[PDB]
A = this chain, B = another copy of it.
Amino acid sequence: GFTRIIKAAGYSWKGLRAAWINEAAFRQEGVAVLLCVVIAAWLDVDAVTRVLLISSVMLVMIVELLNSAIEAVVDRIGSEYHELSGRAKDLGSAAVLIAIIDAVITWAILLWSHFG
């Protein structure tokens, strides 16, 4: 049961590693998310505000990774132009963008509310 955990953790690290190595944009996003978590962790806010600040940027990373898994599947099927290939990447990018706008807005609402 905890043999599945080890194996799964190993796959997870490989995914993070590959995402980091292969694109500057993912590394820069990773920097942004880590800076936000650190800032949230040190900010003088209540616990529920702290969790909202942290979990909104975490969600960006989650959807980013899920969208990148979709892209890899699409690219696996081939370099071919295909209507559903394009559509699959369009839907997934849209998801990523919603998560990001949500994080940004969540941060602006709460920090403005905090007035600091």
Contact = CB atoms under 8 A, between A and B. Distances in A.
Contacts of A77: 73, 76-77
Contacts of A50: 109
Q: How large is the interface on A (under 10, 10 to 19, 20 to 34, 35 or more residues)?
A: 35 or more
A36 interface: no
Interface in A18-70: 18-20, 25, 28, 46-52, 54-56, 58-59, 61-63, 65-70
9 smallest beta-carbon distances between A and B, as pairs: A15-B90, A15-B94, A47-B113, A76-B84, A69-B91, A72-B88, A11-B93, A65-B95, A12-B97
B90 A11 contact: yes
Contact of A66 (B9, B11, B70): B70
Given A47-B113, A50-B109, A58-B102, A92 B63 contact: no
Contact of A94 (B12, B84, B87): B12
Contact of A110 (B18, B47, B82, B93): B47
A82 B76 contact: yes
A82 B75 CA distance: 11
